[PDB]
Design an enzyme around this catalytic site. Sequence first.
Site, mmCIF file in Angstrom:
data_model
loop_
_atom_site.group_PDB
_atom_site.id
_atom_site.type_symbol
_atom_site.label_atom_id
_atom_site.label_comp_id
_atom_site.label_asym_id
_atom_site.label_seq_id
_atom_site.Cartn_x
_atom_site.Cartn_y
_atom_site.Cartn_z
ATOM 1 N N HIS A 1 0.805 -1.216 0.000
ATOM 2 C CA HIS A 1 0.000 0.000 0.000
ATOM 3 C C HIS A 1 0.847 1.280 0.000
ATOM 4 C CE1 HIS A 1 0.387 0.221 4.486
ATOM 5 N NE2 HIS A 1 0.292 1.516 4.232
ATOM 6 N N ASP B 1 -0.187 -7.579 2.050
ATOM 7 C CA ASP B 1 0.309 -6.213 1.908
ATOM 8 C C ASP B 1 1.839 -6.207 1.916
ATOM 9 O OD1 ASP B 1 0.446 -3.460 1.776
ATOM 10 O OD2 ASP B 1 -0.283 -3.133 3.828
ATOM 11 N N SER C 1 3.806 3.091 7.894
ATOM 12 C CA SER C 1 3.500 2.076 6.880
ATOM 13 C C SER C 1 4.751 1.552 6.229
ATOM 14 C CB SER C 1 2.667 2.693 5.755
ATOM 15 O OG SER C 1 1.355 2.993 6.186
HETATM 16 C C1 06P Z 1 -2.370 1.741 13.559
HETATM 17 N N1 06P Z 1 -2.007 2.032 12.167
HETATM 18 C C2 06P Z 1 -1.150 1.225 11.521
HETATM 19 C C3 06P Z 1 -0.785 1.474 10.201
HETATM 20 C C4 06P Z 1 -1.308 2.588 9.550
HETATM 21 C C5 06P Z 1 -0.945 2.895 8.110
HETATM 22 N N2 06P Z 1 -1.852 2.178 7.198
HETATM 23 C C6 06P Z 1 -2.911 2.750 6.625
HETATM 24 O O1 06P Z 1 -3.212 3.924 6.831
HETATM 25 C C7 06P Z 1 -3.752 1.895 5.715
HETATM 26 C C8 06P Z 1 -3.537 2.308 4.262
HETATM 27 C C9 06P Z 1 -4.910 2.234 3.610
HETATM 28 C C10 06P Z 1 -5.897 2.534 4.729
HETATM 29 N N3 06P Z 1 -5.180 2.121 5.941
HETATM 30 C C11 06P Z 1 -5.684 1.959 7.161
HETATM 31 O O2 06P Z 1 -4.972 1.616 8.103
HETATM 32 C C12 06P Z 1 -7.157 2.226 7.355
HETATM 33 N N4 06P Z 1 -7.325 3.117 8.489
HETATM 34 C C13 06P Z 1 -7.958 0.950 7.646
HETATM 35 C C14 06P Z 1 -8.064 0.072 6.419
HETATM 36 C C15 06P Z 1 -7.535 -1.208 6.457
HETATM 37 C C16 06P Z 1 -7.600 -2.036 5.346
HETATM 38 C C17 06P Z 1 -8.219 -1.587 4.184
HETATM 39 C C18 06P Z 1 -8.757 -0.309 4.145
HETATM 40 C C19 06P Z 1 -8.682 0.527 5.255
HETATM 41 C C20 06P Z 1 -2.195 3.403 10.238
HETATM 42 C C21 06P Z 1 -2.531 3.106 11.552
#
Ligand code: 06P
Lengths: 28, 251, 12
Positions: free
Chosen positions: B43, B99, B198
């Site tokens: 991602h 991912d 990320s």
């Molecule tokens: C606790 N935390 C851990 C990692 C992150 C970084 N990751 C992210 O921000 C990721 C990227 C797409 C949306 N996302 C997310 O974490 C979304 N908030 C939740 C989501 C999960 C799966 C599919 C769609 C949306 C953010 C927060």
Amino acid sequence: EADCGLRPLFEKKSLEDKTERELLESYI
Amino acid sequence: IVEGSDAEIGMSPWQVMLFRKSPQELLCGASLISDRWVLTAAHCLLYPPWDKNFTENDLLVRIGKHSRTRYERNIEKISMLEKIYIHPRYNWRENLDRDIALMKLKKPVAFSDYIHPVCLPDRETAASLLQAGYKGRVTGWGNLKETGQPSVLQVVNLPIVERPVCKDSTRIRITDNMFCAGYKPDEGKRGDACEGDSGGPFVMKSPFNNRWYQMGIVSWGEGCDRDGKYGFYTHVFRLKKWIQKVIDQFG
Amino acid sequence: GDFEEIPEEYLQ
Ligand SMILES: C[n+]1ccc(CNC(=O)[C@@H]2CCCN2C(=O)[C@H](N)Cc2ccccc2)cc1
Ligand SMILES: *[C@@H]1O[C@H](CO)[C@@H](O)[C@H](O)[C@H]1NC(C)=O
Ligand code: NA
Ligand code: NA
């Protein structure tokens, strides 16, 4: 790599970082 | 990283920063796994809901860093990307299943006191260490709070959480290619990854051979460090067959 | 935004 996961400034010189013991203690 | 602390110098020498060329900005974390290969979250490179689709020439990787914003002359090394490989079954449509992505560097990076690869787990190390209650370590330059940014690399140690608790914390469908970590509300302590972390590594130090292994990749979470929520990580060992196939096929 | 400029060689 044969040397993977061994940090030059820690494992390589037998120095521990400030919180790695927290990890070890959890491995029960 | 929320509720973490400043990293020590050389504490995470496999830490990589994914850096956008224009505008110049942090994109993600990543990890060094050999002199020519970097591991990150898919991602970080491809996420159509946010109009994200990076190509090789959009990006740089910066290795050996501590400071988030400074150019760390004589310490960090900056590499161009030869090729990006995203897992062919990466599920960006639904739940970020699988991912994971690899990036091959144009040229090998020189190892130093500040630059050194992390190990990837074998089946036995994974089985031994990926247990509820066992703690790993997450590192990154991402947000310090859900709703700002650190001067230097942040670190937090977090316990792996029982799968049923992970499942019951969210409406998102969890898979065997994920695990979750963090403290429960009743445990007092806290901490989590956040936006910008990320792609960074969740690592554990094997008590059998005293080497650091990358068990997870920072993947997703609903908010950051919320009570009753947990951070979700790509299960590196479960996807290692793909990793090895790419490296074997493409060098 | 708040990032120190990197050497031009890497942006070529
Ligand atoms: C606790 N935390 C851990 C990692 C992150 C970084 N990751 C992210 O921000 C990721 C990227 C797409 C949306 N996302 C997310 O974490 C979304 N908030 C939740 C989501 C999960 C799966 C599919 C769609 C949306 C953010 C927060
Ligand atoms: C992303 O970019 C590639 C090439 O630039 C393109 O072929 C693809 O269709 C785009 N969208 C994806 C992979 O979802
Ligand atoms: Na659920
Ligand atoms: Na939480």
